[PDB]
Amino acid sequence: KNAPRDALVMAQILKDMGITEYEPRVINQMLEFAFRYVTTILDDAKIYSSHAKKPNVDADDVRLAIQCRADQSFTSPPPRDFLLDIARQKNQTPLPLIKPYAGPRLPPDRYCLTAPNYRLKSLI
Amino acid sequence: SVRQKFDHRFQPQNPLSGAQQFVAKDPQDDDDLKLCSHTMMLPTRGQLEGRMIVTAYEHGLDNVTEEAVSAVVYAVENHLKDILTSVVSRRKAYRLRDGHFKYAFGSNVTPQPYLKNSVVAYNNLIESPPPPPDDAEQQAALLLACSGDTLPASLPPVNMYDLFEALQVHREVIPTHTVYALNIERIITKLWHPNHEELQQDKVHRQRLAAKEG
Amino acid sequence: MKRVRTEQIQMAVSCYLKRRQYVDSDGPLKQGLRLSQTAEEMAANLTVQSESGCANIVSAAPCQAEPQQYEVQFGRLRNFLTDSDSQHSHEVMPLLYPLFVYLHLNLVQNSPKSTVESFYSRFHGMFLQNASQKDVIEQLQTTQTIQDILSNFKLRAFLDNKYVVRLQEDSYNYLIRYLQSDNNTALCKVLTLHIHLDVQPAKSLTTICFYAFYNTEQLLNTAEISPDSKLLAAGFDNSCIKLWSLRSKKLKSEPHQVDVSRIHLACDILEEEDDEDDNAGTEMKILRGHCGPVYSTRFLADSSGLLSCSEDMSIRYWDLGSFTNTVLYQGHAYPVWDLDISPYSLYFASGSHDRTARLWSFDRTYPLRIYAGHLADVDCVKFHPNSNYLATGSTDKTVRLWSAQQGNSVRLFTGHRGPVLSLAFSPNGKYLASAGEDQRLKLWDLASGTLYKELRGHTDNITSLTFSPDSGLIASASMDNSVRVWDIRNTYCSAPADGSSSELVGVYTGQMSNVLSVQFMACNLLLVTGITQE
Amino acid sequence: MQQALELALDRAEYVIESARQRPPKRSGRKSVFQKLYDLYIEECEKEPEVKKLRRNVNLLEKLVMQETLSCLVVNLYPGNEGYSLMLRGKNGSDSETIRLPYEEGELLEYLDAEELPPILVDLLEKSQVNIFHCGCVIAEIRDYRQSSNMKSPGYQSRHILLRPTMQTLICDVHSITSDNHKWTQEDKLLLESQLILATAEPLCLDPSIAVTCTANRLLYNKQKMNTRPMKRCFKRYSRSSLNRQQDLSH
Amino acid sequence: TKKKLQDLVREVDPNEQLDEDVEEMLLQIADDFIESVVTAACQLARHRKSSTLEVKDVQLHLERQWNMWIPGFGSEEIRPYKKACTTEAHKQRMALIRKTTKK
Amino acid sequence: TPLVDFLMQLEDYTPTIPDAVTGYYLNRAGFEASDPRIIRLISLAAQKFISDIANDALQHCKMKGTASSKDRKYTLTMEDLTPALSEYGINVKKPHYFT
Amino acid sequence: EERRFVEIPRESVRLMAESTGLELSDEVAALLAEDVCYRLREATQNSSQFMKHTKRRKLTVEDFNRALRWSSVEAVCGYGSQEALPMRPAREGELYFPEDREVNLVELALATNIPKGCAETAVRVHVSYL
Amino acid sequence: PCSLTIHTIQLIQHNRRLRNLIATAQAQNXXXXXXXXXXXXXXXXXXXXXXDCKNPNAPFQIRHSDPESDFYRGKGEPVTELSWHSCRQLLYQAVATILAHAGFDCANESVLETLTDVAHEYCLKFTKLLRFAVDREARLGQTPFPDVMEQVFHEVGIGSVLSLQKFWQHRIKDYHSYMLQISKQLSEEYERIVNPE
Amino acid sequence: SISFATELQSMMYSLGDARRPLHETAVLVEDVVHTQLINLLQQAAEVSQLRGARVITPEDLLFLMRKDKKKLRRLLKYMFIRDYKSKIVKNNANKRQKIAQDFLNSIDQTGELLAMFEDXXXXXXXXXXXXESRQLSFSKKASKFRDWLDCSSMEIKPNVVAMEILAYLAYETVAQLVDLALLVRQDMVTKAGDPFSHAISATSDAIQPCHIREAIRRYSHRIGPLSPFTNAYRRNGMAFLAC
Amino acid sequence: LDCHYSGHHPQPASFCTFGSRQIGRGYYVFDSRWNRLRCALNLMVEKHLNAQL
């Protein structure tokens, strides 16, 4: 019909994640994203192959380029294992000792957003 | 319709399945690394070679060209200096040459831009055609006068908060995700500032010292 | 190469338990009851575990072999405690006697003969006036070898038990300030192993009130009402928070020199504007200062101030004296999703995109505890009514109850088909509800840690929950633009219009677009919020 | 508000006092923790000899002599010697390790907090011995750091309990699932849930903030000496710091 | 010669000085930096079946990832700029689309 | 001829960017958009940023056809924008035709 | 137990690679296709996460760019118009392209178009009994 | 001056077209009635008057900002709020105006819609830098530079706020003067060629 | 194999250096200049390809240096002096200037370039008796330079005129690097508490290699506007110290 | 006229491990600090196993 196949693929992905409705040009955005990713990966593969002094590129060059790209760009938070270690090293410190309060106590002034610039002059 | 609602969701690839396998070698006394966390110093050329060879081994290599050691030493020093520059920029003025080259990191010249005198001095004292001592002394006095800081103040030594803010802002000084992600979390767990009670004891000790001085 | 079976899991669990010696040498089907306890026995357990080890040995003790120091440390301490003219110098005086006795006794077990005599001579003449302590002070005089300490009767109870001392918090900090000032390692070892300081603090059906926002235009994100029902706050996709006065009074700020939602140049003067009485109040205020979409705003227990979290991975406390951000908590490197405050405003926690939650105090600008263990984003968080346990929902379809003070996972429920979005405790501290994209509402039994009840009927994402102050009814809001109240108490009914029959009490789907919040108040009140169009 | 807090604090103080004085009383094999609780119960009944002193102060160090228990020993030699680990054998035998320097203080941090390292367990299981006791592993710390008597014992045998931590549980989950079978995410979560349910401390589910006040008091007193300045001061004079200082003279 | 962090700090700004925690953190970061860079260079060497870790591997990795150029190691490896030409089919479709747009 | 101080000059510089746009952008970061000086300065910075790109694009367009006159319509194509943008680490790669 | 996951064809990857000026083999095309599909799904999940916390169903381009920014990836520019961009088939009937009409700048440069501000927010209370 | 410069560019292009047609036709040889004197693009309604009797190039003249003025004190009224839908249209028009001022006169829709988003990104980043600097100052109570604006200007490549005056001088005022001179010269040439004396 | 180590060791002292310049310093400076020249040549090659000439004409090199006005103005003045000198040795000797003015007239749109162009020494410093060691020394210079560059195995090549520009660019590179090293040394040894000492700076005892390494590290960083809070926008390349 | 599809969720050809290494069974590290201690302990357990025979 009107659409090409790639637009249908992207719409199907959006459906899969559970997106009911959306702005139209989102699909164009996704197409440009995929195109740019592929082109940059190929360009990097060219350099990594020419470094190895060999003819037209192959699987190994592409995989190396993808590894280098992923070591930089497509990121996400560290895993559970590292977080558990830092958590263990953090929880050992003591907590404050509760006492009756006339409302919660704020931290000291030297560490609060209540300091005027010293250059500025004040007026009466 | 509902049952087949969560069957095509995203399944992130676990990052550990591609973890490196560790093989035990002979425990010898000569085979030691000296990670900089242990020895509170930068590693010398010789010390770096021991661990470079050890790492190379697990990848099926023979030895290092001995020009690589120099490059790695230079790069490590360069990278540390880059981070230090990022941290310094956030709490001191500086100048610019050619638009990016930052050299004079004191807080001195910084002509206040809203003074008619500053506007005039900027045009001349900055664009110098590319110095008798009396003239230089006069012009230094002028630059200090225009800066506007009548009663300059200073900061305590560099602490954790400065590093945290610097790293959060710039973030192009650590392009690699692995180095940044693991160390930022560590930095978070070392943030600290004295609480009310400690400040009270500081008050008391100051009273004590003042008294014993009188 | 096939998926394991249900029983095989129990088999592996039993194998683990046997290997680590948790159960007897047989089938412990008798065992598996100790899943709860009362206050006094919890105190007993924690007291037994507190004295079942030493908190610090390896680093707390000195390593240099220089016996001359034991004199210097004690001498400096005595000099400092003497010239002091404070009320603390009083309260921290009693420690000298156990310190001397234990330092001498430890010298004996490893010290050549030269040192001990000089030590006894240099300080002994201050533990005489009291009678109860002259006995042992004199007894020590005739003591050289280890057989002295084991043989004698009075030395023994000292050697094999700890001395008690009572201090205030201020006094203990008085000792710590000195201890950290310089090398005092030997004294730290004595305090760690032998002395036992004790620090304690110094001295007739329901009625619905509904709210609607008109001019929002896909920007309103959340809203809330304070406990005393006098304020209404909301957050927006464009970073900003707006506040309304429910009562007939106006909102007016008071003088304040500093504001972060403002920029001054070098050529400005800080002056408190006097052309101000012209305003004399207004019904609405805009709070500014986040640089990203806001996702939660919570009130304090006593409606004193406001707290909020934003996409810019920051948490800000707003002072309602001046309606200005005055504190800023920075403890995250990724966007913060949720926030929550403890029953009496003692703590507050926060879930984040970084797969973890963190504990905070209102008087320190840095996290205190970290609860790692979830596999993905921590989207929901709620305190327990007693403010000692913590529940957190995650996109991995799991819910974990945590131990606030200690910080380890104590429970882990499973069964949801999709991510979780809300949580709620009943004020009797017995059950925990949770809802998510699956469109099922599960109540869990905390003590047994097993499914207790399942409710169905909503047809779209459930995004809020709440109990009545008597665990009577549980109200839910869904993405279908509906509000349904429920009853779980034995009172049964026969109204099976859908899956759940006898619990579904009332349904309210009037003219209303997306819902925002649901609450309860003193007497059969159920406040609601959301946007509408008609 | 202030009134409610004062009520809760009074309740917590009362509960602490009564639990200290009037403990309540709660098989072929009796747990090590059961024996600890019982030795605690006994010590309450007795009276002390000296005024201003208590008896129930070292439940472990006392419950060591009362029978044989398999422990893990740590040797802390003086000077720049290092440290080493020993493992008593079934045959009145022994084994010991290389002497590791005092700079690589990775293990000492674990010992300093009474937390079971995860590297230890993977091997201790391979060594077919029953040194575990309800997850925890008892360890003995011998140190010749300070002594000039030239005797036979020349060390101060301290005992401590290395409790397991959330790291150990995740390692266990990883270990059990590495069997020939397949495991799906749901199944791993089920296994973890069962393990957590089995070995978790009992819950004091009760709606009153007296509970949290009591818990805060007890924990604070447990760990009131781990402030950041304390640890900085300890680290400032530790042996590795001294070894660094000597180099600076040149 | 011995090297300390303050020695590097002096190069950037003589008058500044850090706390102790910052000193620990910077060394930890340096450890991680080395552990990553050397591994990456070793893999680049592994790519071309080479037996020895040559410097040009480190040069390539530093230039491509960390945008770092260490200056004193020659110019034996500088790629000569190419034409970067396109293929027949591509130009064919571009001409086709130009035609379809013309009328 | 005159050399008035900076704030006197700034009141004469009119920015192409409207004030409401700068207010929109200031409100995102949490600032009250009422000070005219700040609005002016931010708008001027944005204008400079765009102007530099425009200049580079026009020069690149001039150089394109040299080998192989003045009266011609100057139009802007992606092949002129890409090198100009790349000066600022912006990598433009856009598809041409889909399927 | 049987499930499906749409993936792009080998032909699309080869067509993209053509613009670069490289002729790709058979295995490489499928490798790249699977990698690109994984990245698309990751980015889409991340984008949906931001929308989850706003109580709105439509997904904007701002959400996508925000998710890309947090994942340390350059952003996509030129699709924030809130108006449809129809596609065009060529003569044969297999190639498509987007309409890109030339525009005379001076007309837009010399034109006054006053915009309408927004209206202030307000809240009405609405009680009921049941 | 921006609008008038665009106008002058159009007039100059028109004049060159007329000049080339006429010169070529009468080099080869109403073909007897040349066009006609076009028409100046009426100078602005401010720059004109500035082009009163005080002739501000006088000596002993001082001009300074009144410190009581609203502008100097930095006082005004909150700008009009407007949604994203309309903000994008206004920024689109501004980008078109800048492109026209540059020297172009037409372009592709994709190029313009892309430059709009590039500007969007730049504005967001500038304001975020401002946010962070303001918070840091509010905590520590001091700034590296005299004020936060100077800091942010330094951190985005620009040298200092005092570089804006040079930028304006070179890029706007002198550009307008250059265009006027060229327009007058070409108009005089056309006048000399239409009606020889 | 060739080298300029001894030649540069004398060039440097002209630019405010010690009586006896260090050797390995010049060794490293040689490689720095070589690398910058090679990369500049590649960029020029990319420039020419648009015009479709397959020769690196002076217009291509003059195009890369179209941003910094002061350096461009100095380049134009040097071109004037070179055409004038060649005239005195012998288009009517306005060839270089003709080319430069033609190109700048071609590209400019605001009259900003022309400003640098329009605005007694060449006779006051010429009253002696010069009648051909100068020409021979210049020939030695150019001949050695062409060989040292090794500019043959390239799909495109520079012509006769552009080589003069390239040599001038190498000299300017050397001067700029010396200047930056001097600024870095000025910064390091300050330890100044008195504000006058730190302020008069707006205007061993030799330039060790560490100074040059620091200067290059510091210059390599460019402050882009879309950098903050990310790393997805790096100007992947190398700053040209001379251009 | 069907969009090509596979029976399993896609996987990335190469991804980003965080520099982690697996010590034994079911334990991962990120810093190479336990290398010395692990070698020592492995030898200890080796010998302690040898002697029981």
mmCIF file of C-alpha atoms in Angstrom, chain D residues 72-221:
data_model
loop_
_atom_site.group_PDB
_atom_site.id
_atom_site.type_symbol
_atom_site.label_atom_id
_atom_site.label_comp_id
_atom_site.label_asym_id
_atom_site.label_seq_id
_atom_site.Cartn_x
_atom_site.Cartn_y
_atom_site.Cartn_z
ATOM 1 C CA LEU D 72 39.849 -20.593 60.310
ATOM 2 C CA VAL D 73 43.029 -19.025 61.645
ATOM 3 C CA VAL D 74 44.758 -15.823 60.544
ATOM 4 C CA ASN D 75 48.405 -15.058 61.320
ATOM 5 C CA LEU D 76 49.450 -11.397 61.445
ATOM 6 C CA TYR D 77 53.232 -11.368 61.683
ATOM 7 C CA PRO D 78 55.021 -8.198 62.797
ATOM 8 C CA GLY D 79 57.102 -5.618 61.001
ATOM 9 C CA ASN D 80 56.702 -5.925 57.244
ATOM 10 C CA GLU D 81 56.280 -9.700 57.406
ATOM 11 C CA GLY D 82 52.700 -9.844 56.131
ATOM 12 C CA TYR D 83 49.856 -12.195 56.958
ATOM 13 C CA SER D 84 48.958 -15.810 56.280
ATOM 14 C CA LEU D 85 46.069 -18.243 56.631
ATOM 15 C CA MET D 86 46.062 -21.642 58.341
ATOM 16 C CA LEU D 87 43.593 -24.519 58.081
ATOM 17 C CA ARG D 88 43.739 -27.185 60.779
ATOM 18 C CA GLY D 89 43.467 -30.693 59.377
ATOM 19 C CA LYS D 90 41.568 -33.794 60.459
ATOM 20 C CA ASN D 91 44.832 -35.540 61.363
ATOM 21 C CA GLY D 92 46.369 -33.164 63.893
ATOM 22 C CA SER D 93 48.000 -31.730 60.782
ATOM 23 C CA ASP D 94 48.030 -28.233 59.337
ATOM 24 C CA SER D 95 48.602 -26.160 56.220
ATOM 25 C CA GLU D 96 49.613 -22.542 55.714
ATOM 26 C CA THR D 97 49.915 -20.069 52.870
ATOM 27 C CA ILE D 98 52.480 -17.706 51.413
ATOM 28 C CA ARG D 99 53.018 -14.507 53.392
ATOM 29 C CA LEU D 100 51.143 -11.711 51.653
ATOM 30 C CA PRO D 101 52.325 -8.124 52.171
ATOM 31 C CA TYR D 102 50.547 -5.546 54.285
ATOM 32 C CA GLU D 103 49.745 -3.327 51.298
ATOM 33 C CA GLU D 104 47.188 -5.635 49.648
ATOM 34 C CA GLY D 105 44.671 -5.049 52.405
ATOM 35 C CA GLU D 106 41.713 -6.400 50.446
ATOM 36 C CA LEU D 107 41.019 -9.285 52.833
ATOM 37 C CA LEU D 108 41.703 -7.290 55.990
ATOM 38 C CA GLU D 109 38.824 -4.984 55.071
ATOM 39 C CA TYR D 110 36.517 -8.005 55.079
ATOM 40 C CA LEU D 111 37.934 -9.160 58.407
ATOM 41 C CA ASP D 112 37.648 -5.622 59.779
ATOM 42 C CA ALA D 113 33.856 -5.750 59.332
ATOM 43 C CA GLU D 114 33.052 -9.418 60.080
ATOM 44 C CA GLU D 115 31.849 -10.099 56.535
ATOM 45 C CA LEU D 116 32.459 -13.392 54.768
ATOM 46 C CA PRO D 117 34.446 -12.827 51.556
ATOM 47 C CA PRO D 118 32.968 -14.608 48.522
ATOM 48 C CA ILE D 119 36.305 -15.911 47.238
ATOM 49 C CA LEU D 120 36.756 -17.860 50.469
ATOM 50 C CA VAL D 121 33.543 -19.901 50.228
ATOM 51 C CA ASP D 122 34.070 -21.192 46.687
ATOM 52 C CA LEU D 123 37.208 -22.960 47.906
ATOM 53 C CA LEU D 124 36.169 -23.822 51.463
ATOM 54 C CA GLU D 125 33.354 -25.845 49.917
ATOM 55 C CA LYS D 126 35.871 -27.715 47.746
ATOM 56 C CA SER D 127 37.880 -28.513 50.865
ATOM 57 C CA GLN D 128 35.547 -31.113 52.338
ATOM 58 C CA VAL D 129 35.306 -29.786 55.879
ATOM 59 C CA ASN D 130 32.273 -28.760 57.942
ATOM 60 C CA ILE D 131 33.612 -25.425 59.195
ATOM 61 C CA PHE D 132 30.307 -23.694 58.367
ATOM 62 C CA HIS D 133 27.835 -23.092 61.203
ATOM 63 C CA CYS D 134 24.525 -21.609 60.028
ATOM 64 C CA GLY D 135 26.113 -19.797 57.105
ATOM 65 C CA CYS D 136 28.644 -18.034 59.314
ATOM 66 C CA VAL D 137 32.267 -19.138 59.646
ATOM 67 C CA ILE D 138 34.126 -18.633 62.919
ATOM 68 C CA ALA D 139 37.684 -17.350 62.551
ATOM 69 C CA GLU D 140 40.615 -16.901 64.926
ATOM 70 C CA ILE D 141 42.994 -13.957 64.602
ATOM 71 C CA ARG D 142 46.515 -14.438 65.944
ATOM 72 C CA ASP D 143 48.794 -11.398 65.740
ATOM 73 C CA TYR D 144 52.454 -11.123 66.698
ATOM 74 C CA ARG D 145 52.363 -7.434 65.799
ATOM 75 C CA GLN D 146 53.308 -6.215 69.298
ATOM 76 C CA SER D 147 55.339 -8.435 71.628
ATOM 77 C CA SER D 148 58.879 -8.542 73.051
ATOM 78 C CA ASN D 149 58.568 -11.349 75.614
ATOM 79 C CA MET D 150 59.900 -14.209 73.489
ATOM 80 C CA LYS D 151 57.376 -16.736 74.810
ATOM 81 C CA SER D 152 55.489 -19.675 73.352
ATOM 82 C CA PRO D 153 52.001 -18.129 72.923
ATOM 83 C CA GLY D 154 53.094 -14.579 72.127
ATOM 84 C CA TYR D 155 49.709 -13.796 70.566
ATOM 85 C CA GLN D 156 46.192 -12.771 71.592
ATOM 86 C CA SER D 157 43.698 -15.293 70.242
ATOM 87 C CA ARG D 158 40.626 -13.297 69.216
ATOM 88 C CA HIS D 159 37.550 -14.967 67.743
ATOM 89 C CA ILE D 160 35.021 -13.372 65.404
ATOM 90 C CA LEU D 161 32.023 -14.480 63.363
ATOM 91 C CA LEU D 162 32.105 -13.891 59.603
ATOM 92 C CA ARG D 163 28.436 -13.494 58.773
ATOM 93 C CA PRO D 164 27.362 -14.156 55.168
ATOM 94 C CA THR D 165 26.221 -11.175 53.105
ATOM 95 C CA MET D 166 24.123 -10.439 50.037
ATOM 96 C CA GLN D 167 27.215 -10.961 47.887
ATOM 97 C CA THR D 168 27.439 -14.552 49.096
ATOM 98 C CA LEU D 169 23.773 -15.204 48.330
ATOM 99 C CA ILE D 170 24.103 -13.953 44.755
ATOM 100 C CA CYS D 171 27.225 -16.060 44.296
ATOM 101 C CA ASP D 172 25.271 -19.058 45.592
ATOM 102 C CA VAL D 173 22.445 -18.363 43.144
ATOM 103 C CA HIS D 174 25.026 -18.233 40.361
ATOM 104 C CA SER D 175 26.574 -21.499 41.546
ATOM 105 C CA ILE D 176 23.412 -23.587 41.902
ATOM 106 C CA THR D 177 22.095 -22.609 38.465
ATOM 107 C CA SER D 178 25.270 -23.699 36.648
ATOM 108 C CA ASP D 179 23.983 -27.278 36.475
ATOM 109 C CA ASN D 180 23.360 -29.163 33.237
ATOM 110 C CA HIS D 181 19.683 -28.175 33.187
ATOM 111 C CA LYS D 182 18.237 -25.061 31.614
ATOM 112 C CA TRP D 183 17.127 -22.149 33.780
ATOM 113 C CA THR D 184 14.765 -19.366 32.772
ATOM 114 C CA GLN D 185 14.685 -15.950 34.396
ATOM 115 C CA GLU D 186 11.466 -16.743 36.259
ATOM 116 C CA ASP D 187 13.051 -19.922 37.618
ATOM 117 C CA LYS D 188 16.181 -18.120 38.826
ATOM 118 C CA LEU D 189 13.979 -15.617 40.631
ATOM 119 C CA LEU D 190 11.980 -18.452 42.210
ATOM 120 C CA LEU D 191 15.171 -20.096 43.466
ATOM 121 C CA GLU D 192 16.429 -16.805 44.890
ATOM 122 C CA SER D 193 13.079 -16.153 46.571
ATOM 123 C CA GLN D 194 13.117 -19.564 48.236
ATOM 124 C CA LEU D 195 16.698 -19.121 49.432
ATOM 125 C CA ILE D 196 15.942 -15.672 50.867
ATOM 126 C CA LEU D 197 12.808 -16.940 52.604
ATOM 127 C CA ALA D 198 14.654 -19.847 54.203
ATOM 128 C CA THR D 199 17.654 -18.058 55.730
ATOM 129 C CA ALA D 200 16.202 -14.634 56.565
ATOM 130 C CA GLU D 201 15.967 -13.080 60.016
ATOM 131 C CA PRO D 202 12.449 -13.105 61.517
ATOM 132 C CA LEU D 203 10.353 -10.008 60.859
ATOM 133 C CA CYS D 204 8.943 -7.808 63.631
ATOM 134 C CA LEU D 205 5.808 -6.799 61.721
ATOM 135 C CA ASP D 206 4.126 -4.317 64.052
ATOM 136 C CA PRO D 207 2.735 -0.813 63.376
ATOM 137 C CA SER D 208 4.524 1.307 65.970
ATOM 138 C CA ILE D 209 7.697 3.347 65.636
ATOM 139 C CA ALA D 210 8.945 2.029 68.955
ATOM 140 C CA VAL D 211 10.356 -0.834 66.878
ATOM 141 C CA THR D 212 12.496 1.430 64.710
ATOM 142 C CA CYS D 213 13.686 3.434 67.722
ATOM 143 C CA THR D 214 14.882 0.251 69.423
ATOM 144 C CA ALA D 215 16.546 -0.981 66.235
ATOM 145 C CA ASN D 216 18.303 2.338 65.678
ATOM 146 C CA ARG D 217 19.610 2.452 69.241
ATOM 147 C CA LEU D 218 20.961 -1.091 69.126
ATOM 148 C CA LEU D 219 22.574 -0.753 65.695
ATOM 149 C CA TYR D 220 24.067 2.659 66.473
ATOM 150 C CA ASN D 221 25.675 1.258 69.602
#
